[PDB]
Structure 1
């Protein structure tokens, strides 16, 4: 990018609060604020090098925790019962996540950076693998940017959790809206028991770290369909309606009974006047 906005260098030390709470309908969610928990939990986005101190508070009546993929954490912040890293009811604990930039090691080899599309979830509700917590909605996305990564206009999180999208009832979305030409980022995560295949009409991306081709030398497959299983995460960016125009573009699990049973949503791409060809 040379006109798109790109990520700066980290790393700052950042602090934030998270809460786990039971929702009125029986679900459980994370939130940055007591009373404003969501499923998925809020996006946490940092730059390679950042350190994040999370003051986590379990407001529920059962033990709960916070476990992250991909990022550096000491065993103190594992989020597991086994290393006494979870949180008693009403309790409070400070988790620490660090991230690093890539570079040469002394042995001459190349250390990978932390950058990528990751996620966090509970590891102790219902079972010692968080099966109950995850089923109830205790998951959320984490993005770590490499210096110079292209930044989007908007980021959406899509989570295939067992037979639901974002724990929603069958055939109730979510739907997302964009205007032709928007740079839209998708963070796609899978949880539970089943494998799925994520499919998007009218759009495609690269099957690599960023979902974007670096330039003509990148041999990564360009795809519009990807098989995923529990705790897989990936992400990409697309230009809404690029080459295809406005429309009510479906995304869905392409497993046939899954889409049939409601794992379907809409990517609503609008003309500037806000209209969508052949929609309602």
Structure 2
């Protein structure tokens, strides 16, 4: 594995919006997608530019308490200060007792654990969250990568209805990372596409039992990911993704997966400005 070091900025975007970024003034909601290969180490300097206590906490990666991102463990960041966080990962290895310790690979995420409560409630509400992708050697890689976060009644903290439009060309390999947050329950559904329900979303071997699905529970704290071939067997056009909970979709958690023609030209019913 390799050791990588990055600086991450926590910034107030607006009254309602706090976010993480890889450069000063570049914070986004959702935050940047962080990638590691199993066994890599990532070291992050979290620069808190805000007037709030806040922090950084991951899922799935190896971290000790001093990296856990909680006030309880002395791991948060005071306003105008920087904290070093250290995330490790490992390949699968055999234990002395005969058993198998699984490698770190999976679709994970990170987010504030310190802002407004010990559980980071206000931090998450206002957008400090981001995808953490830990790859196993040999995993297939995407042309396009989308992070979808159902945060309470919001998709990626967008306004009443502006749900992100995610875009691909017909036939491209597309990676969806999906993360739930907040106090609300959701079900993530994508029209016209489907994946196997397992780590990568695709068949690993003839013995793989996993069912094919077009929809999956996305609850607070939960993350998964998968890959599809854009418009495979269905063609291009505007493909809806949304929360299948009926009053939720009506309140606007619905958005478009836009699949253009292979050459990148717009499909039938679309009006370009």
| Bucket of the pairwise TM-score, normalised by the shorter protein | over 0.9
| 1:246 equivalenced with 2:236 (yes/no) | yes
Paired residue for 2:110? Answer: 120
Paired residue for 1:277? Answer: 268
- For structure 2, the 5+ residue unaligned runs are none
Equivalent-residue separation in structure 1 for 2:112 and 2:182 (angstroms): 12
Equivalent-residue separation in structure 1 for 2:217 and 2:186 (angstroms): 6
Q: 1:139 aligns with which of 125, 129, 136?
A: 129
Moved more, 154-163 or 216-225: 216-225
Asked if the contact 2:56–2:111 (Cα under 8 Å) also holds between the matched residues in 1, the reply is yes
Q: 1:110 aligns with which of 94, 100, 104?
A: 100
Report deviation, 1:150: 0.7
Asked if the contact 1:123–1:133 (Cα under 8 Å) also holds between the matched residues in 2, the reply is yes
Detail structure 1 runs of 4+ shifted over 3 Å in the superposition. Answer: none
Q: 2:63 aligns with which of 69, 73, 85?
A: 73
Asked if the contact 2:110–2:130 (Cα under 8 Å) also holds between the matched residues in 1, the reply is yes
> Number of aligned pairs?
270
**Are the structure 2 counterparts of residues 273 and 154 from structure 1 closer, same or farther at C-alpha, using a change threshold of 3 Å?**
closer
**Are the structure 2 counterparts of residues 109 and 91 from structure 1 closer, same or farther at C-alpha, using a change threshold of 3 Å?**
same
Q: 1:186 aligns with which of 151, 167, 176?
A: 176
Moved more, 269-278 or 228-237: 269-278
Equivalent-residue separation in structure 2 for 1:275 and 1:52 (angstroms): 39
Equivalent-residue separation in structure 2 for 1:177 and 1:138 (angstroms): 24
Deviations 1:39-96 (A, max 9, x none): 0000000100100110111111111110000000011101000011101110111100
| 1:169 equivalenced with 2:159 (yes/no) | yes
Q: 2:86 aligns with which of 83, 96, 108?
A: 96
Q: 1:226 aligns with which of 201, 216, 232?
A: 216
Report the secondary structure of 1:129's partner residue: coil
Equivalent-residue separation in structure 1 for 2:239 and 2:52 (angstroms): 41
| 1:55 equivalenced with 2:55 (yes/no) | no
Equivalent-residue separation in structure 2 for 1:276 and 1:171 (angstroms): 23
Report the secondary structure of 1:269's partner residue: strand
Equivalent-residue separation in structure 1 for 2:125 and 2:88 (angstroms): 27
Equivalent-residue separation in structure 1 for 2:2 and 2:217 (angstroms): 36
Scaled by the length of structure 2, what TM-score is found? Answer: 0.97
| 1:255 equivalenced with 2:253 (yes/no) | no
**Are the structure 2 counterparts of residues 80 and 270 from structure 1 closer, same or farther at C-alpha, using a change threshold of 3 Å?**
same
Report deviation, 1:273: 5.3
| 1:36 equivalenced with 2:26 (yes/no) | yes
Paired residue for 1:148? Answer: 138
Equivalent-residue separation in structure 1 for 2:211 and 2:81 (angstroms): 46
Asked if the contact 1:268–1:276 (Cα under 8 Å) also holds between the matched residues in 2, the reply is no
Asked if the contact 1:170–1:263 (Cα under 8 Å) also holds between the matched residues in 2, the reply is no
Report the secondary structure of 1:23's partner residue: strand
